[PDB]
Amino acid sequence: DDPIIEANGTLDELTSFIGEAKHYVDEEMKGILEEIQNDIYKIMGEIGSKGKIEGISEERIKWLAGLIERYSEMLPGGTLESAKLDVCRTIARRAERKVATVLREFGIGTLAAIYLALLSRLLFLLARVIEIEKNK
Amino acid sequence: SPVVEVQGTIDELNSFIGYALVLSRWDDIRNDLFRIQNDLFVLGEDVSTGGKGRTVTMDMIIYLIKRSVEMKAEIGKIELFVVPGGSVESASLHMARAVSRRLERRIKAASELTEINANVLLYANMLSNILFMHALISNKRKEELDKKL
């Protein structure tokens, strides 16, 4: 129960920080972050229910992979928005660690762990893309 | 050693996947199975060496996930409590999936005694899922061919 509580709390922190950071990005990245928040809500629903409630699907992971591929062609906190995204990335890494702990303890959350790894990669890429576009 | 048991189960799963590939009649399924055999070599190297050598990358997991998404789109709604069998291709794929589940159990047992990268277990889970999808695709295509006549 303790790993479940810690993972859900870390995911709540991650989605709160993403909700804070989405007000500094453009409309496209704001919509991407809102979809990410919805996916985090699904992951929290699955983890808090110990897998009884269905969580995210592989389609969301494919969506994250497509975003990573699209943005991969293009000190933390080069800009303020980049700093917000870097903070979100660190919290996403911590949430990934917590979900990995949950998966070992209960066997639920493989797709969630994959999604969180891809999410940390995407947050890093989005911060770098914001820095590049603002510099350009 | 638990790693020895994991490696033996990997070899058995590789044999079963090779048999299913021989029985398979579709290019995409056979390409997936051959890539899975190569990734099983990679995963065995990752487990045996503890990560010093080649390791299971996120790219392989993402490839499995993309193939699973495409096959889910092709299949449509999936019914619960599927009886394994139907055709020799689907039966071999179900046997390979059962061996893959056994490999997942062996990896979970071994991780409690030694350090194993999480990507290994993630890939094993995705491999079981993709083998289930392969079996469903084989059954669906066989049924379509039978309905053609």
Author numbering:
A (entry chain A): 24 to 97, 104 to 165
B (entry chain B): 23 to 171
Sentences from the paper on this structure:
In the present study, we demonstrate a protein design advance that substantially rigidifies a cryo-EM scaffold based on fusion of a DARPin as the modular binding domain to a designed protein cage. Analogous to antibodies, sequence variations in the nonconserved loop regions of a DARPin protein can be selected in the laboratory in order to obtain a variant that binds nearly any protein of interest.
In the earlier design, the individual DARPin arms—12 in total emanating from the tetrahedrally symmetric cage—protruded separately from each other, thus suffering from residual flexibility. To make further stabilizing contacts possible, we investigated alternative design choices for a scaffold. The designed interfaces between protruding DARPins were proposed to confer additional stability to these key binding components of the scaffold. Drugs bound to a minor cleft region of the protein near that location are of key pharmaceutical interest, including covalent inhibitors targeting cysteine mutants (i.e., G12C or G13C). We therefore undertook a series of structural studies on known KRAS mutants, focusing on the degree of atomic interpretability in 3D density maps obtained using the cryo-EM scaffold described above; a DARPin with loop sequences that bind the GDP-bound form of KRAS was already known from prior work, enabling the scaffold to be readily repurposed to image GDP-bound KRAS structures. All three KRAS variants were found to bind with good occupancy to our cryo-EM scaffold (presenting the KRAS-specific DARPin). For the G12C mutant, the resolution was 2.2 Å for the entire particle and 3.0 Å around the KRAS protein.
